[PDB]
Amino acid sequence: MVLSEGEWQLVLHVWAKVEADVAGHGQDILIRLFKSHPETLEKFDRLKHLKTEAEMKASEDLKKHGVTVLTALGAILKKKGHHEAELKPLAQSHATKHKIPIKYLEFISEAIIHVLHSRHPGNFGADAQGAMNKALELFRKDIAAKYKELGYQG
Ligand code: HEM
């Protein structure tokens, strides 16, 4: 797939709001992912022991990681589809080191869309949500094509 430039604008216009608080959004997103789909927390060897949302909220390691995730994703969105170099090292670690199935990337995509919708209703109407979803689907499709070259297609 290919997004039009107006779709990328909608995506980078909300993203600019997210970047006002990268650590807070990181936290929200990862917590929404873990509560919705608890099985995903098992993949994290540092975080696994967390039992409640109160524990998640107070974890400095969860917050540090959320910043790591959003910073990497942001650098990929800002590429506007020309992200092949940024996707290589990411596809290699998630496919052969962490072992993250495509299904899980769909779950965090859902958590990103949930949080933006709650925090940014004015900049995340139906068109901008459709453009964010298209941008994350492009991301998943290109990662999945890389997982298969790497021998994982998980
Ligand atoms: C929007 C998609 C995602 C982005 C952009 C992302 C990004 C990253 C980055 C930049 C790192 C550190 C460098 C590396 O290991 O490659 C990382 C590590 C990791 N990622 Fe992801 N990730 C995403 C989705 C996921 C999901 C959905 C899971 C599990 C459900 C997962 C589990 C992990 C684990 C287990 C590590 C290692 C954490 C640690 O022990 O420090 N990732 N991720």
Secondary structure of 81-116 as H, E, C letters = CCCHHHHHHHHHHHHHHHCCCHHHHHHHHHHHHHHH
How many Å is the Cα radius of gyration of the chain?
A: 15
Q: Is 84 exposed, middle or buried (0-12, 13-18, 19+ CB in 10 A)?
A: exposed
Q: Which of 104, 117, 105, 138 is nearest to 7 (CA)?
A: 138
> What CA dihedral angle connects 145, 93, 50 and 56, to 10 degrees?
-70
Q: Which domains does the chain have, with CATH numbers?
A: 1-154 (1.10.490.10)
As a whole number of angstroms, the longest Cα–Cα distance in the chain is: 43
What residue numbers does the annotated binding site for nitrite cover?
65
- Could you tell me if 3 and 135 are in contact, meaning their C-beta atoms sit under 8 angstroms apart? yes
Residues within a 6 A CB radius of ligand 1: 40, 43-46, 68-69, 72-73, 90, 93-94, 98, 100, 104-105, 108
Nearest CA to ligand 1 atom 6: 69
CB under 8 Å to 107, separation ≥6 — which residues? 33, 36, 37, 40
The ligand 1 atom nearest the CA atom of 46: 40
**Reported resolution, Å:** 1.9
Nearest CA to ligand 1 atom 3: 69
Taking the CA of residue 33 as centre, how many other CA atoms within 13 Å lie in the half-sphere pointing to its CB? 26
Instruction: Name the experiment that determined this structure.
Output: X-ray
What residue numbers does the annotated binding site for heme b cover?
94
> Beta-carbon neighbour count of residue 118 at 10 Å?
10
